[PDB]
């Protein structure tokens, strides 16, 4: 629509040199009175027709769901035979659903079936294909507890060293300010 | 600005016609003789002289 209706990106930046120019380029800062002057920008882009619609009755929270896939159900029974009641891992194992709706799915599947769930808790399968799916479909690194623990310890040590260096720099600045105050008292008399 | 409007007097149809078409002023309460009280000869057809 910017191509259709209409440089065009006339905005500001994090610094004061905004435009065109940063200042005058003839002899000195000439356009500093104009560079020192946000609300004048490009907005005539998104035009849409009107209506007199409504959203009443009940608006706000809710749940947009569907009749569930039977292949998703087979994957859920294989998962509960492989890696059980692990709400966060189950929400991550289906990474386009959400959290409260799969909790309603937990209580719904806890309702109707004792046999395959009892055989699932009988099974005790080791979690390798679950990590395979979680590392392919998400492309997450999953660094182990030694590497992640060492990285967290290194970050904590870097933060403690930065805090100690800031405290030492503040003490040195306070000592320099006390020396400057003593020098000003010596120069006042 | 005080005294802009007035309740509509209906003593007669002449009252309802003559309270309209009325030229109120700014010199409302001031005891000055022969100033903005005596009518001027530039009123022939402009305003009523009686």
């Amino acid at each position: 629509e910017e191509r259709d209706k209409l440089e065009s990106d006339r905005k500001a930046h994090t610094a004061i040199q905004l435009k065109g120019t940063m200042a005058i380029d003839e002899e000195t800062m000439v356009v500093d009175r104009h560079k020192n002057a946000e609300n004048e920008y490009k907005e005539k882009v998104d035009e849409n027709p009107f209506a007199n619609l409504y959203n009443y009755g009940s608006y706000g929270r809710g749940s947009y769901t569907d009749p569930w896939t039977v292949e998703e159900m087979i994957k859920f029974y294989k998962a509960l035979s492989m890696w059980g009641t692990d709400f966060n891992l189950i929400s991550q194992l289906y990474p386009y659903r959400s959290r409260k709706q799969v909790k309603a799915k937990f209580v719904n599947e806890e309702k109707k079936r004792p046999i395959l769930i009892e055989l699932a808790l009988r099974s005790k399968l080791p979690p390798n294909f679950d990590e395979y799916c979680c590392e392919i479909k998400k492309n997450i690194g999953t660094v182990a507890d030694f590497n992640e623990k060492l990285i967290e310890l290194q970050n904590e040590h870097k933060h403690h060293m930065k805090e100690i260096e800031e405290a030492k720099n503040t003490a040195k600045e306070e000592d320099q300010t006390a020396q400057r105050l003593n020098d000003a008292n010596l120069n006042k008399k | 600005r005080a005294g802009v409007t007035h309740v509509l007097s209906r003593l007669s149809y002449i009252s309802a016609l003559g309270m309209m078409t009325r030229i109120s002023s700014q010199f409302e309460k001031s005891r000055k003789v022969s100033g903005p009280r005596a009518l001027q000869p530039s009123q022939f057809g402009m305003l009523c002289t009686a």
Partner: protein
């Protein structure tokens, strides 16, 4: 002359103290949201009187240009 005498009286004065060292041009202001406005064209013809000036020379010999070309224009006008 009058601005020169006031500047010479404002020369070597001790009233511009050490504020002249820490002069910053960081005073960029937002656009005039409904509080009070800028100059904005009311004195732009009064403001632009020192920004530029051209040195235009004398004429002293010009006879042909704005006299004969005017008659040559009538040769192509033709009513």
């Amino acid at each position: 002359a009058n601005v020169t005498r006031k500047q010479e009286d404002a020369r070597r004065n001790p009233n511009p103290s050490s504020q002249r060292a820490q002069v910053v041009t960081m005073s960029v202001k937002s656009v005039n949201d409904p509080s009070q406005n800028r100059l904005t064209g009311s004195l732009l013809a009064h403001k632009v009187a020192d920004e530029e000036a051209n040195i235009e020379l004398t004429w002293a010999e010009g006879t042909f240009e704005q006299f004969k070309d005017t008659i040559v224009k009538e040769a192509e006008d033709k009513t």
